[PDB]
């Protein structure tokens, strides 16, 4: 059964960084990548970061184009990922995710999503 | 007068586990393909061939 676990709430305050971890099991972590969208309360889901877990080719959006920096592992196959320069709006839900809509070698994009 | 022995009753294989498999799925589940005349080339090595 593929098991995503993600960390504990945070409550860094405003001029600092947060730093979250995801992990994956149950399933080849090298076969797939990782996504992590965002939702704010009361909003709908904002995607935010990309990255295939094979040779370390990341993908940001532009509203997070310098904002924020990632990660991972693969001797525990997990992701670490940096935001930084926080502010009042960044108060929401981070959520992980198994991405099928780009590749994990080659970055060819897939016909799928983070089931 | 000779020699006494038991024989094996089942049989057992162990091998490591199927880990990062080759980037078959991305080559076959692209979401767009390429023409004839320009077919898309690419190299896999270093993987299981599941």
Known sequence: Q????????????????????????????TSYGISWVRQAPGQGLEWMGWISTYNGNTNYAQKFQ?????????????????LRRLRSDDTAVYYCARDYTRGAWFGESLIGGFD | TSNFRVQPTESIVRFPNITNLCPFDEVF????????????????????AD
């Open chain 1, 2 to 29: 593929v098991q995503l676990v993600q960390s504990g709430a945070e409550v860094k305050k405003p001029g600092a960084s947060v730093k979250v971890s995801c992990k994956a099991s149950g399933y080849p972590f």
């Open chain 1, 66 to 82: 310098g904002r924020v920096t990632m990660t991972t592992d693969t001797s525990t196959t997990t992701g670490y990922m940096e």
């Open chain 2, 29 to 48: 589940n692209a979401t767009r393909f390429a023409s004839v005349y320009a077919w898309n080339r690419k190299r896999i090595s270093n993987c299981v």
